[PDB]
Design a protein around this ligand. Structure first.
Ligand SMILES: Cc1c(N)cccc1F
Ligand SMILES: [Cl-]
Ligand SMILES: [Cl-]
Length: 162
């Protein structure tokens, strides 16, 4: 198990523009295209990112290219965030994947609001952090996944990903 397999399981793979859990246009492996409700806006974004007129459709290699780039940006985002960085370096390798997962799904932002949890995770209070993490719109909106990520932070193993 690694980040890529992990995320591939949580986000799945689609070659055609689709709406994600929140209604936004996305493609590939959870690659958000835009929050606007204008599909055309989304197709433009698509083209821009792929660098070619896709007409809402892409290849597998293309999807995986976005994927790489996205995994990268995210970690990179973590590392650059002052509040994030320290927590992230205090973790073992599996838990790190869990951090990445969240940021990928929610942004530097979305996450920058889990202070209490962050702190708990930094103190290595697994069970506490996990209960904390669950008291969230995040868990309530996408429980199955959130469950997998939380079990991941709690245990430090890939059990939930089987
Ligand atoms: C999202 C996250 C968590 N949960 C813990 C440490 C760093 C980080 F970016
Ligand atoms: Cl791109
Ligand atoms: Cl879910």
């Amino acid at each position: 198990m690694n980040i890529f397999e992990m995320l591939r399981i949580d986000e799945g793979l689609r070659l055609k523009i689709y709406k994600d859990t929140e209604g936004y246009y996305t493609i590939g492996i959870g690659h958000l295209l835009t929050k606007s409700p204008s599909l055309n806006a989304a197709k433009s974004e698509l083209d821009k990112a792929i660098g070619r007129n896709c007409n809402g459709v892409i290849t597998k290699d293309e999807a995986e290219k976005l994927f790489n780039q996205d995994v990268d940006a995210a970690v990179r985002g973590i590392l650059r965030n002052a509040k994030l960085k320290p927590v992230y370096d205090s973790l073992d390798a599996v838990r790190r994947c869990a951090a990445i997962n969240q940021v990928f799904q929610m942004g530097e932002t979305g996450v920058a609001g889990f202070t209490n949890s962050l702190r708990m995770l930094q103190q290595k209070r697994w069970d506490e952090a996990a209960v904390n993490l669950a008291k969230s719109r995040w868990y309530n909106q996408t429980p199955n996944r959130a469950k997998r990520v939380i079990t991941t932070f709690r245990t430090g193993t890939w059990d939930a990903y089987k």
